[PDB]
Design a protein around this ligand. Structure first.
Ligand SMILES: [Mg+2]
Ligand SMILES: [Mg+2]
Ligand SMILES: [Mg+2]
Ligand SMILES: [Mg+2]
Ligand SMILES: [Mg+2]
Ligand SMILES: [Mg+2]
Ligand SMILES: [Mg+2]
Ligand SMILES: [Mg+2]
Ligand SMILES: [Mg+2]
Ligand SMILES: [Mg+2]
Ligand SMILES: [Mg+2]
Ligand SMILES: [Mg+2]
Ligand SMILES: [Mg+2]
Ligand SMILES: [Mg+2]
Ligand SMILES: [Mg+2]
Ligand SMILES: [Mg+2]
Ligand SMILES: [Mg+2]
Ligand SMILES: [Mg+2]
Ligand SMILES: [Mg+2]
Ligand SMILES: [Mg+2]
Ligand SMILES: [Mg+2]
Ligand SMILES: [Mg+2]
Ligand SMILES: [Mg+2]
Ligand SMILES: [Mg+2]
Ligand SMILES: [Mg+2]
Ligand SMILES: [Mg+2]
Ligand SMILES: [Mg+2]
Ligand SMILES: [Mg+2]
Lengths: 102, 72, 8, 141, 206, 62, 140, 144, 84, 68
RNA sequence: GCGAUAACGAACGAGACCUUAACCUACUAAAUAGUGCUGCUAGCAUUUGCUGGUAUAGUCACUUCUUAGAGGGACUAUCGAUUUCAAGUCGAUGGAAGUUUGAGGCAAUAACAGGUCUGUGAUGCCCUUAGACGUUCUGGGCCGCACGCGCGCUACACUGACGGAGCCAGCGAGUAUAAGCCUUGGCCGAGAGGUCUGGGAAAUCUUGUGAAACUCCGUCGUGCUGGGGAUAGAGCAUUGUAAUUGUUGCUCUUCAACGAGGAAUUCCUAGUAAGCGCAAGUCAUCAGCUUGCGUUGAUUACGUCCCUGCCCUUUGUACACACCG
């Protein structure tokens, strides 16, 4: 249990904090001589819900079209497990959630 | 209702076909039906053999359309 | 009009 | 230079492989081929009663040649067509499973295909050998 | 005469084209005559095409249709009556077959006959209506070359469409009969009855 | 006896629905006797359109 | 390696990735000869980029394309664009640019879609009708 | 595989199962005139009788005509599947049957009183001449 | 879970606080005009670019009415309404 | 139509009255100059303001313009 | 907007703005995307070639195709015409894009007795509150059929029906001790459908959703015909406690009006109309419905106030609860 090929999966609704955490981890993986693969932009998922505007059923048939974009990025690191987890706490962000899988 | 096109080929019509089709600028399924009074299915088998017998030259080959001309 | 009427 | 299946038109290659497979006679034909319709969406059985099974097996062999581990469920969708629902709009419906499963099973006992790892049905070591042969005897005219 | 072969072999007959672009490698444009001075700029035969299917953008500006090939304008008008909209590949088949029938008959160049049938089918004066909110007040007016050309294609294909309805004669050879008769100016053909009747009414309004 | 007249000036849309256009025509031969006439279809300048009858002018249409 | 250029042509959704390598002139569609295009009535659309310049231009190069997406007709226009762009792109990189500008002149003078992808895309559908502009029939 | 001629052998009008069949119709579609014989059924009895479908009705000889009416009357005896039959799992004797021209309306009728005799809901609506399969009648089927 | 309570820095710029404050005044029987102008001036005093208050309902009268109280500069259409 | 609005017409003519010597008849040069002269919130309004300023510059060399 | 100007200079709305589609061989990377090479490997002619499989260690190379973030790119750019030489408009050239680049989202000042208390543990008041008008259980009804009307789907055939064969998208969705999701692959079954394993909480698997129109080759041959598939009889499965008033699907049989539709009237200008299917929503089951998506893809204007509706100006008014005066 030392140096491993380690995956960090990043998902969030907003891209600004996602790219800051992504760049900050990449920055810390640069000055630290750790070979890295990423970030990989997964195809963004558009969660769309189309309801009727009318609470009742009177009027012209008008519809809302709500959206919820989900952006997912995965980054591959080659480092021991202790090093990668402390990197996560350095780049902790409320919006972006992190899951680590070996 | 008035069509009553002949579907069985007798001998009087057979040699009349071989005597009339060569003297045509353009023969097709409808041309055979229109003037020889034979049915569409009987026209299609007549065209496929008349080409095999050399009397008729195939201008264009197609399932829905058979364009033929005289070979003389 | 209406008025719940009983039988049993 | 050589000849492959991909170098010959599909429509007249199958008409040639169908002719060989019928004259060879070794393909086992199930007993209901004179009764059944190819798909539940169809309304009539095939018009070429004597030869339709051979031609469909020829089509199945060629289609499997060009791909990797195609299943039998995928074959039903491929040969399926638009069903004639009376007043409701048309819809795509899959073909009959037994006809396709018997063909691939029949093709499996003639030596052209076999069950591939991770699902599907691969083409046999000899399956490539004999299809490419038929292609050569197709284009000489 | 230069019979090249590539590694991907190319048939002999199709190689006979680095020479001239003939429609359906049979129909040359070199020998074609818009036999009317007034429609030369609106019957486009200067740019040869192989197949009457270009998928161009001729509906963006106002007069881009005059730049569309004349055969492609004819095959566009065939796919009508709901069930045929968007079926261009079927429409090209009718045109390809129609030209061969026009070739075996009268032996002329099939696309020359098409040009003759279009110039002879467009009415030169149509009587437009100028009714002031209901009353009948017909007035005779002139016809522009563009509307003259494109109404000819509309009338020629409409007549062929109705002649092939519930008739053993196929649409390709109903179009051939419609085009051949109108090309030679015969009054038996549809779209020549209409053109004369249009120009006849215009004479009854001046 | 049809006469051909090239158009040299598009005056404007006339008629009740605007479907007819006033245009200024000039004859191909004998480049004179310029006449104002009405035309049904879409018209640009320099369009070669023939006249069944020549001896008639045009004015605004209803 | 060798003189290899890779390009692509596009129609509505169809995209034809052209691998114009060099060689004896091998030209295949998804591993199949162009002599076997399925739409016979449209077989001359992919023959146009060949006969316009002359088959002698393809002696030294071999082209292998992989076309996916779109529809039957939309794929034909994607293939002919990948071929036309691939021939031009090879000349710009491995031949003098005088010849590349010559080839580009004949192609553009015949059909813009040989080199320029059509920008038309499907209009989105709007509610209140079955189509982009079409609306449900109204009654009074 | 080529045009052939005949004289005096064609029979313009046929009589099968007390039904008149036009002799110039193709055999597969001529039998569909017999009520109780559809296109799907006529295709199989001709294939079971080794009568190639490329023959018109009048082309057939007497030997073939009797061979067809025998198969239609005994379908199960000619490897005709039970599920392919008109009247399978019969009400009274429980065997698979295929009713034909004159027998069809008799047992179709016998089914109607059998529904009406027990006075079921489906039988009642059949008596009224209304739709029995749950169709709405509020706005459709207003002719007469 | 841990909950922290934090004071809003600029109470005048929060429409939620201003709407809750207005309700606590209207429920005390204070007149609408005196109550409405109490949020118009409180919002602007905090530095808002603009503010508009609409109060709808019924007050002693059987018929219901709505009154708008604008002030300053207000934008209405487009994305900036989602930002500012 | 392509009628420019007032937010682009008046903002462009303030530039000419203020930075005429540094302006020119080339849109590309003008486009870069106005990114360091004005604070434009959106790129599209940048290439509009400069595109109408170029038209005015092209018009000033042919005679006097109204409003500048 | 130009311009005219007792007005000058402004604000909201419009426009700007935001989302999406179309370009980038110019950056940034990608074993959940793709490719060439390379290992290993198959078939066909042997010329070293042409088609493949395999490849999560070849511990390869690359980012064009695929994905998305930072940017760049179009501003009517240049040139011709017209114009008060102004705002502008029409043509070309270049261009991925020159109709606001295409399409949408948001959208002012006031207002309607417009529609909803049948969306709300949103509500004032009135009614009821134990034989309830609360709530629950069983069964029926909301589908009920002499009729009038509206949104639509099939069709009236040959530019077509079938029968084989060819075989191409995009928008999306998907589960656990549940209360059961998407389901390939194999095996049975004519079908509908059944069964055994496995993958996938997902660019990984379903899925290239191998969709339909479409195309080729055949049968049919103007015939209420092989168009059309109502109505009905008999039978086989699925979902569900429960299918009778057939949930739906499948098999055989019956095979009706309809032979292009009067007076009237609707929608629509470019990837648009029209066909043609597919997905998501409702959903245990049922899509002839909507919301989207893509395949094939036109005719005809690019004009006008003649009809119709709305806006502005002038005008009349005994109306202002404003002609429902
Ligand atoms: Mg299919
Ligand atoms: Mg099929
Ligand atoms: Mg149909
Ligand atoms: Mg149907
Ligand atoms: Mg604003
Ligand atoms: Mg806006
Ligand atoms: Mg504003
Ligand atoms: Mg891998
Ligand atoms: Mg390899
Ligand atoms: Mg817009
Ligand atoms: Mg009311
Ligand atoms: Mg309530
Ligand atoms: Mg309530
Ligand atoms: Mg609710
Ligand atoms: Mg109770
Ligand atoms: Mg109801
Ligand atoms: Mg009922
Ligand atoms: Mg509606
Ligand atoms: Mg016909
Ligand atoms: Mg078919
Ligand atoms: Mg996938
Ligand atoms: Mg019938
Ligand atoms: Mg039925
Ligand atoms: Mg109308
Ligand atoms: Mg109307
Ligand atoms: Mg239900
Ligand atoms: Mg559904
Ligand atoms: Mg007044």
């Amino acid at each position: 249990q030392q140096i491993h090929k380690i995956r960090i999966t990043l998902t969030s609704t907003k891209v600004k904090q996602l790219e800051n955490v992504s760049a900050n981890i990449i920055r810390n993986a640069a000055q630290y001589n750790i070979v890295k693969k990423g970030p990989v932009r997964m195809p963004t998922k558009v969660l769309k819900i189309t309801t009727r505007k009318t609470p009742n059923g009177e009027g012209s048939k008008t519809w809302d079209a709500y959206e919820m974009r989900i952006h997912k990025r995965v980054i591959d690191l080659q480092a021991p497990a202790s090093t990668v987890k402390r990197i996560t706490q350095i780049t902790i962000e409320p919006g972006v959630d992190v899951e680590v899988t070996i | 209702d008035k069509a009553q096109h002949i579907v069985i080929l007798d001998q009087e019509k057979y040699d009349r076909i071989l005597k009339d089709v060569p003297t045509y600028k353009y023969v097709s399924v409808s041309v055979l039906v229109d003037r020889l009074k034979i049915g569409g299915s009987l026209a299609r088998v007549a065209l496929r053999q008349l080409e095999e017998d050399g009397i008729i030259t195939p201008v264009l080959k197609h399932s829905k359309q058979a364009i033929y001309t005289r070979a003389q | 009009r209406k008025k719940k009427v009983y039988t049993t | 230079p050589g000849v492959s299946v991909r170098d010959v038109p599909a429509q007249d290659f199958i008409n040639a492989y169908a002719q060989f497979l019928q004259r060879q006679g070794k393909l086992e034909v199930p007993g209901y081929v004179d009764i059944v319709k190819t798909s539940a969406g169809n309304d009539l059985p095939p018009q070429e009663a004597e030869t339709w099974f051979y031609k469909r097996a020829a089509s199945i062999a060629r289609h499997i040649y060009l791909r990797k581990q195609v299943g039998v469920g995928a074959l039903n969708k491929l040969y399926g067509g638009a069903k004639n629902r009376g007043f409701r709009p048309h819809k795509h419906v899959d073909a009959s499973g037994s006809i396709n499963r018997k063909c691939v099973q029949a093709l499996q006992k003639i030596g052209v295909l076999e069950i591939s790892p991770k699902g599907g049905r691969r083409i046999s070591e000899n399956g490539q050998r004999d299809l490419d042969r038929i292609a050569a005897q197709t284009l000489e005219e | 005469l230069q019979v090249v072969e590539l590694a991907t072999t190319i048939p002999l007959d199709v190689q006979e084209a680095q020479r001239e672009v003939k429609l359906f490698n049979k129909w040359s444009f070199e020998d074609v005559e818009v036999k009317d001075v007034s429609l030369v700029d609106y019957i486009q035969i200067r740019n040869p095409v192989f197949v009457s299917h270009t998928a161009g953008k001729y509906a963006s500006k106002r007069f881009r249709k005059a730049q569309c090939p004349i055969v492609e304008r004819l095959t566009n008008s065939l796919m009508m009556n709901g069930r045929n909209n968007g079926k261009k590949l079927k429409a090209v088949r009718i045109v390809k077959h129609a030209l061969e029938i026009i070739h075996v008959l009268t032996e002329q160049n099939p696309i020359q006959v098409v040009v003759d049938a279009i110039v002879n089918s467009g009415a030169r004066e149509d009587s437009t209506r100028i009714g002031s909110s209901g009353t009948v007040r017909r007035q005779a007016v002139d016809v522009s070359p563009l509307r003259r050309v494109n109404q000819a294609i509309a009338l020629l294909t409409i007549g062929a469409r109705e002649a092939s309805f519930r008739n053993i004669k196929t649409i390709a050879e109903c179009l051939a009969e419609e085009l051949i008769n109108a090309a030679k100016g015969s009054s038996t053909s549809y779209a020549i009855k209409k053109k004369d009747e249009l120009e006849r009414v215009a004479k009854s309004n001046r | 006896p049809v006469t051909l007249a090239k158009v040299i000036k598009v005056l404007g849309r006339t008629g009740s629905r605007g479907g007819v256009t006033q245009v200024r025509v000039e004859f191909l031969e004998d480049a004179s006797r310029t006449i104002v006439r009405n035309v049904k279809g879409p018209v640009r300048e320099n369009d070669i359109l023939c006249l069944m009858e020549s001896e008639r002018e045009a004015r605004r249409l209803r | 390696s060798t003189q290899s250029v890779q390009t692509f042509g596009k129609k509505k959704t169809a995209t034809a990735v052209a691998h114009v390598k060099a060689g004896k002139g091998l030209i295949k569609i998804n591993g199949s000869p162009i002599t076997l295009v399925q739409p016979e009535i449209l077989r001359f659309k992919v023959y146009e980029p060949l006969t316009l310049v002359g088959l002698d231009k393809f002696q030294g190069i071999d082209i292998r394309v992989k076309v996916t997406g779109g529809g039957h007709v939309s794929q034909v226009y994607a293939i002919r664009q990948a071929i036309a762009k691939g021939l031009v792109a090879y000349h710009q990189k491995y031949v003098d640019e005088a010849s590349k500008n010559e080839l580009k002149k004949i192609f553009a003078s015949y059909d813009k879609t040989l080199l320029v992808a059509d920008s038309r895309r499907m209009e989105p559908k709007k509610f209140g009708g079955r189509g982009a502009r079409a609306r449900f029939q109204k009654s009074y | 595989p080529l045009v052939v001629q005949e004289q005096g052998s064609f029979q313009h009008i046929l009589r099968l199962l007390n039904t008149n069949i036009d002799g110039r119709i193709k055999i597969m579609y001529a039998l569909t005139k017999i009520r109780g014989v559809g296109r799907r059924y006529a295709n199989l009895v001709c294939k079971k009788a080794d009568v190639e479908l490329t023959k018109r009705a009048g082309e057939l000889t007497q030997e073939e005509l009797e061979r067809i009416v025998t198969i239609m009357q005994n379908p199960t005896n000619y490897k005709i599947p039970a599920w392919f039959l008109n009247r399978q799992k019969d009400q009274v004797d429980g065997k698979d049957y295929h009713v034909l021209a004159n027998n069809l309306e008799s047992k179709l009728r016998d089914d109607l009183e059998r529904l009406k005799k027990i006075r079921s809901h489906r039988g009642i609506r059949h008596f009224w001449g209304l739709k029995v399969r749950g169709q709405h009648t509020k706005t459709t089927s207003r002719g007469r | 879970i841990a909950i922290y309570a934090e004071r809003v820095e600029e109470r005048g710029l929060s429409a939620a606080v201003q709407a809750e404050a207005l309700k606590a005044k209207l429920l005390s029987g204070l007149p609408i005009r005196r109550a409405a102008y109490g949020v118009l001036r409180f919002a602007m005093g905090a530095g808002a670019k603009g503010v508009e208050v609409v109060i709808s309902g019924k007050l002693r009268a059987a018929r219901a009415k709505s009154q708008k109280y604008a002030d300053g500069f207000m934008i209405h259409s487009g994305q900036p309404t989602r930002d500012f | 139509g392509r009628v420019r609005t007032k937010t682009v017409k008046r903002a462009s003519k303030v530039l000419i009255e203020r930075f005429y010597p540094k302006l020119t008849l080339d849109f590309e040069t003008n486009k870069r100059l106005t990114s360091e002269i004005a604070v434009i919130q959106s790129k599209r309004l940048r290439n509009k303001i400069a595109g109408y300023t170029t038209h005015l510059m092209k018009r000033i060399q042919k005679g006097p313009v109204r409003g500048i």
